[PDB]
Symmetry: C3
């Protein structure tokens, strides 16, 4: 229940190609980053499919094409009508199969990087060579970007388009090798074949959290850690271990869906046999699957809340972890009082959540303390104190959602640095207040490095 009271600094992210930030207090901008991401991923997928369909089928199996065809090409009726359970199983299996292939590739490269030099095979030597050539490009890019900064800057380290970022940053491209416009990542392949899209379409279960970042913050940090000097093989692993963390987190989610939730969906279909007009054993009726609806504010994302009074200095993050690790934390801000709150919380009791030992406080208990502790600060004006006291007896106003790309543990670690690292706290709050709020979001999602 941390109530910590708050040179060049860089957001560990790339603009253009990289994932977007938003002002936490702007519901519109947060909604639009998701809308734009979906439209951009759909246009990318057409290129992946056209370029690589034969090779995707050869590697991952025709199941991926089957899920794609069902999603957007064919609609079967009567006797030929698709078994939607068989479809749901197919899409879950395909998603898990794509991410496990990604994981194995990063594991192999990570293992090779921490395997002396003499001990490395010819192909281990080859593969580290190819990875280091890309890292050299990223290093030179970051070098040129760094001396372009003003004496006192708070901004993202670099700026490259998605195609340039894939060519330089993506460690283990599945197809597309060293041809720009042709690089096919596991995230691109999943999106192209609409694997998550179909799982969500059939079950109502949101899976936006099951993704990977386009660049690893710890990779960027290591490049800055070694200025001109070549980043150690060991230092590179930090980024690669962050990636495997997220991949394993994704794999555990899909396995939790297959072993825990899939059996109950099957059960629900047979139970509703006499509750549904023209019931079919081949169809998942929306009625049968509302059993597994998480409340919109309990999905695995950064949920943003505003103060119940007119304030642009107060915002609450409530970040929820994947369902299999049924965890969440509170991160509150009052920039007018230079105040930051952190707290670990209890587990939700929604259908999708895995059961844990019942420790931690309620989100409700957490916002009462946030407003309470704020009203006690010596820095607070008599007007502000009275507004915080009114808000405390009041409840926070839900704005919306902002999906995160790192592991839940890494977002937790990012939040921890925002509450404890006092050096961080003084390079973050500079410039227009609305700009400060974006920077806090960026610090929560990726991290900032001070120089």
């Amino acid at each position: 229940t941390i109530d910590g009271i708050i040179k060049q600094a860089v957001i560990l992210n790339v603009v253009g190609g990289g994932d977007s930030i938003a002002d936490p207090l702007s519901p519109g901008e947060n909604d639009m980053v998701h809308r734009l991401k979906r439209l951009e991923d759909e246009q990318k997928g057409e290129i992946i499919r056209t370029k690589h369909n034969a090779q995707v089928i050869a590697k991952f199996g025709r199941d991926l094409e089957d899920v794609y065809k069902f999603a957007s090409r064919e609609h079967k009726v009567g006797e030929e009508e698709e078994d939607q359970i068989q479809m749901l199983e197919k899409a879950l299996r395909a998603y898990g199969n794509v991410v496990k292939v990604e994981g194995e590739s990063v594991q192999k490269l990570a293992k090779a990087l921490r395997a002396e030099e003499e001990e490395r095979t010819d192909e281990e030597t080859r593969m580290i060579g190819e990875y280091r050539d890309k890292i050299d490009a990223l290093s030179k890019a970051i070098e040129i970007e760094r001396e372009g900064l003003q004496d006192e800057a708070i901004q993202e380290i670099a700026g490259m388009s998605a195609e340039v970022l894939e060519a330089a940053a993506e460690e283990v491209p599945i197809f597309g090798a060293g041809v720009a416009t042709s690089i096919a990542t596991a995230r691109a392949i999943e999106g192209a074949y609409k694997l998550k899209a179909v799982i969500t379409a059939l079950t109502g279960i949101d899976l936006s959290h099951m993704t990977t970042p386009k660049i690893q913050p710890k990779t960027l940090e290591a490049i800055l850690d070694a200025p001109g000097g070549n980043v150690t093989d060991l230092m590179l692993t930090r980024g690669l271990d962050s990636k495997i963390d997220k991949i394993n987190e994704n794999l555990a989610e899909v396995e939790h869906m297959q072993t825990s939730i899939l059996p109950r969906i099957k059960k629900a279909i047979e139970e509703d046999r006499d509750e549904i007009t023209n019931w079919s054993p081949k169809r998942i009726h929306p009625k049968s699957v509302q059993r597994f609806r998480v409340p919109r504010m309990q999905t695995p994302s950064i949920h943003i809340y505003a103060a119940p009074w007119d304030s642009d200095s107060v915002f609450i993050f409530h970040v929820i972890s994947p369902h299999h690790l049924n965890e969440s934390f509170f991160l509150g801000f009052d920039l007018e009082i230079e105040y930051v709150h952190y707290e670990d919380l209890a587990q939700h009791w929604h259908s999708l959540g895995a059961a844990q030992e019942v420790t931690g406080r309620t989100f409700r208990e957490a916002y009462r303390e946030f407003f309470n502790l704020a009203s006690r600060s010596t820095m607070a004006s008599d007007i502000h104190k009275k507004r915080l006291q009114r808000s405390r007896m009041s409840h926070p106003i839900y704005l919306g959602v902002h999906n995160y790309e790192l592991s839940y543990i890494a977002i937790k670690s990012n939040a921890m640095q925002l509450v404890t690292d006092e050096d961080l706290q003084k390079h973050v709050l500079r410039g227009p207040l609305h700009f400060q709020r974006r920077v806090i979001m960026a610090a929560l999602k990726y991290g900032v490095k001070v120089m």
Copy 2:
């Protein structure tokens, strides 16, 4: 004219679904309002590719090859010389196709509505079937809304539920034309119109904006009835309230397209023949932009929620000017000064643009309306308002009017609306104008 006090200083829900549902915006943000339209167009174009690929044979079997002809002209073929398309024949084809799609939608809702308000014994086997299938979807929506309601904090103002477009179609769409109970395959009349670029081509050839001719993705009165019956099964009669709201909008759309065909189409034909000797290389097969500027509505007189700001630096003052479809040439004023807890309402006169049907000459000018508004507002500080832009609405004009009416008269509404950051309060007013809020 109605002028009350939005008293500032329970739970209140916006009758809309996030994700799948139509978007709101801060009225004072011109950028966000512009981008909701841009994003909607891009999302509808991606959806249309799936509708076309999955259903083209069945669309042609049901609505006729005219829809495919409009699509092909819009985005697949470009004919030249002797084979060059008669653009009037095209304009007629697209208007006819649009009208044919919406009349099929209307007939389906009518049939379901009629069945729902028929004695159980009186209902046919298929009427019993169809109400069964509709109720199964409503049960899903009810359970969804039930789970969503106990997730709310003690004091919340937000949208009732959150589901993706594909989940919302499966649970909310009463009369899917194709796609039955297969997610990713449900084809609505709104999806079919968009997929075949019917409005797109009418606008492209005439310059006439038709953004207003749409249907909502969920009926607010349907959501209201579900909340009206907590766990308890919504009455068949109660369900009709949403279905009647839908038929209102469909009939409103049908009257617009009929107004375009009988009133405006003849004058466009006339204008082409009149400009015979005013146009270099004139063709009877081409609609020249010169000939069709006669029918240009001023950008601020289109059927939408038009947003204006105060001529001084204020984030508390904003004016809605909502214009009805051209056939019902009506509009109203809805002014806000949140600093003074003030709301203005007023019915206004009819515009004299080409597209407007003539009415009896009552009501004050928009100019007369802002003078009073700004007079009261400037007391806190003649003034002319700053136009920000447009925000298209999905319900009937009558339902938006009714929504505006509740913002001026329902004092219980006024006290749950202005809470949190002022920018958030402005979005909530927009949401209340577009969909409505229910208090609990």
Copy 3:
């Protein structure tokens, strides 16, 4: 270097909403980012229609090279022995881009030349072509006429509002394909985008080319239409817009020629130099390592770069507009709306790889913000907060001329600063990008 005091009828942004290029609040990093994201998605959807409708005619006119660049970008992926020579590709895409814009340029030149030629001197086809251009201008005039009497007594906003397809039909002087058929008009900007020419150059080299574009409407064309109310715009007056277009086309042509003669040879050199610095090096591949030599810092790209004050102020914003690399020029344009203050200053040339060398005059961007922030901070040394980028569509000279009117035209200064401050900032952006006309 000019420092003036902004002072304070109808005033109009010389742009069309819907179909026309977007503005943004300079102090909103999100809205600036999203206008670019939306533009790319809209251009990709448009390109599918251009390709499907016109592929045979594009190949007949410009050659199969355009289709080859498109196919490489989004349709095929060759491997092993059959793998594409990425240098041959880069040359092909640069050649194709240059070939499309030079065809556009020649068409505007021909129409411009005809418009200045005395009526008797004009050929039958010169008479035809001016007739067709004037019919479109009449449509634009009537559109603008109807739009003008819809304005309130005191209005500051864009002159007109039409969708892209309606704007192409009425405004685009020299459509390459699509003639007088809405949904079918193919501009050089549409054709370039459809065949992913710049997309592939950027994808292979990392060099941003967002600046190489044309506006969807010429501000000087709109100005001339307002200059002649009901009265027919003179042939000579129309040329002002047509000369602005040729300015931008020639600016684009000089950039691509600068890329081909100056930068392309060094990229080829860099590939051979890194022969022993790259694991599994190929003479057919452009490795990202080899092309970082030519990376412009993100804040030095040819765009309107926006900076905020290092303190909490919504009245202070700095434009730093950078010209195309071949004309290695830039200027500073600072605003403090709380003090009614505007700063202008010409600056020095950047020393990034892509910049053509000039004579070493002008002050540093750092020197420029020091003074700006000094005067501004008096209301409250300081370093500005970078927000992001906003690409411009007119010639660099025309944006410079637009900035000049914001600092010197005192009549302009009093119709711009009216209404909510956030709205005022958008209007300044609009005035910088297109211009405003007062009536």
